[PDB]
Design a protein around this ligand. Structure first.
Ligand code: HEM
Ligand code: HEM
Ligand SMILES: *[C@@H]1O[C@H](CO)[C@@H](O)[C@H](O)[C@H]1NC(C)=O
Ligand SMILES: *[C@@H]1O[C@H](CO)[C@@H](O)[C@H](O)[C@H]1NC(C)=O
Ligand SMILES: *[C@@H]1O[C@H](CO)[C@@H](O)[C@H](O)[C@H]1NC(C)=O
Ligand SMILES: *[C@@H]1O[C@H](CO)[C@@H](O)[C@H](O)[C@H]1NC(C)=O
Ligand SMILES: *[C@@H]1O[C@H](CO)[C@@H](O)[C@H](O)[C@H]1NC(C)=O
Ligand SMILES: [Mg+2]
Ligand SMILES: [Mg+2]
Lengths: 240, 240
């Protein structure tokens, strides 16, 4: 029984490491991960994701070990390391700019406008709105970034990230693939768990069987096509 | 420093986990890594490679974290996990068969014949012989394997592996890029440190600055050329 009162939100300090991921940033901001954002292992991510969000080890082990590639350390990262373009970090993010034409690390309100204005007339974001947002963000990158990378891999990662905001920030049934806008907006804009606002950790485990169909449905509805070579190669370490 | 007398060679039993890598298998056979070949983390690899071979953390962290992708565990592998084709394990190996046409895991004497007969007339293997062997092994895979994969990435990994046998099994000066055949043959054929034969751990650290030029020279002298998509995508986990 995690006591969320024992995990208060605190804004990061000047020497706290933060990355392009609102999920991990939010866990650090509540002390489920180290508040300094440093020396974070995959076991630590597994535990934090379980405690904070009820996200299970299947997805966190897979994504965590890919994330470990971004650091120079044997078995840890700093959250900022995860900005390394072409490992996980990709163009056509929901709340960050493309690395070739801007800042791929920090929350950007102008970029976030697209998500914030989605699913007009409803009080939730859902699978169809998530797909529309992905379509529109990719169109923006294609229009403004001549170095855009858009592949089967990046498209799948992008749908995974949309599935995450729809499930982790849901009103309590992640299967629904819908989340209150008031929760998701706090998650992105403040990297805070919207506890005041009425959010509670899912009592349903969020695992790959739960996320998989949501991911695939978002992709299907997004009118997606690859760009260029469609090469699914990742960057294997920093510096290279 | 390191007590090699506390690290005797013992042949693996039928249940001991062993992989396609003679470097890690040899460390396990001397107990620098667990003799059962299981529950191995990147920190353990870093320590074992330092103690056994004077290989430094830079290369072992980079390679080790890519190797961790081959298991389902948060921060460990079994050595056999590393056989996963298309993460690190590749066609045109020095001592193993290609997975599409044979056994990509165990030492194979028929395959090893090419390396064993290289640098005729000399008592060492060196950079030019290593390059010739790589050329010949790739030609063999191209001739006989209808699913052969040959990319910039696999070529670089193959040259890295050649650089490893030339440096770790050297007669004490790894910069020379040459190793006694009597040492290298024991390393491959027995996965044993050739201590009775007169081998000693390098007193010179083996790191990426040392290996990089050897790797690049081997590639250069092998007359390597791209043969197709040349898409350097790795497999990011088992079962995918
Ligand atoms: C295994 C652990 C994790 C790793 C290594 C990781 C890594 C990343 C990285 C590198 C990005 C930036 C990609 C980009 O937009 O360019 C990202 C984005 C994202 N992550 Fe995570 N993540 C993890 C876990 C989670 C969790 C548990 C959530 C839960 C809500 C989450 C939600 C998101 C979202 C919504 C984005 C999109 C941000 C945007 O498009 O602006 N992640 N993640
Ligand atoms: C960082 C840790 C290591 C990992 C994860 C690793 C992984 C691997 C893998 C998966 C292979 C098989 C590739 C193939 O031939 O298809 C391989 C081959 C090889 N490794 Fe390692 N290795 C590591 C460290 C070392 C060390 C310290 C040496 C020292 C001599 C070494 C020497 C070799 C050699 C010579 C081969 C070629 C075998 C052949 O072509 O038949 N490795 N390694
Ligand atoms: C943690 O990460 C830093 C790099 O940010 C590294 O220098 C340090 O050795 C790591 N280890 C600790 C403090 O356990
Ligand atoms: C998303 O919500 C909108 C507005 O209520 C609705 O028209 C649409 O059908 C919903 N889509 C899904 C997948 O529920
Ligand atoms: C695996 O290694 C961990 C960490 O060192 C240890 O706690 C555990 O007992 C090991 N398990 C086995 C099966 O040896
Ligand atoms: C390798 O050894 C052979 C035989 O002694 C020699 O001809 C060749 O020049 C050597 N190559 C290098 C790079 O030393
Ligand atoms: C191997 O290549 C043949 C064509 O020569 C193809 O029919 C077969 O599907 C390939 N197998 C794999 C594992 O891709
Ligand atoms: Mg991005
Ligand atoms: Mg192989």
């Amino acid at each position: 029984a995690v006591d969320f009162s024992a995990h208060p939100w605190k804004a990061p300090g000047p020497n706290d490491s933060r990355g392009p991921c609102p999920g991990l940033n939010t866990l650090a901001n509540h002390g489920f991960l180290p508040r300094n954002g440093r020396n974070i292992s995959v076991p630590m991510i597994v535990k934090a994701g379980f405690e904070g969000y009820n996200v299970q080890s299947d997805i966190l082990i897979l994504a965590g070990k890919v994330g470990m590639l971004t650091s120079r350390e044997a078995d840890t990262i700093s959250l900022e390391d995860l900005k390394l373009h072409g490992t996980i970090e990709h163009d056509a993010s929901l709340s960050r700019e493309d690395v070739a034409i801007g800042d791929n690390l920090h929350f950007n309100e102008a970029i976030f406008t697209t998500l914030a204005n989605s699913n007009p007339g409803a009080d939730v974001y859902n699978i169809s709105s998530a797909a529309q947002v992905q379509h529109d963000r990719l169109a923006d990158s294609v229009a403004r970034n001549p170095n855009v990378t858009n592949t089967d891999l990046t498209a799948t990662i992008r749908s995974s990230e949309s599935a995450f905001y729809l499930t982790v920030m849901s009103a309590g049934d992640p299967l629904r693939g819908e989340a209150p806008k008031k929760f998701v907006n706090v998650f992105f804009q403040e990297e805070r768990m919207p506890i005041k606002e009425g959010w509670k950790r899912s009592t349903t485990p969020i695992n790959l069987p739960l996320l998989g169909p949501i991911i695939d449905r978002i992709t299907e509805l997004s009118d997606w096509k690859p760009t260029g070579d469609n090469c699914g190669a990742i960057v294997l370490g920093p510096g290279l």
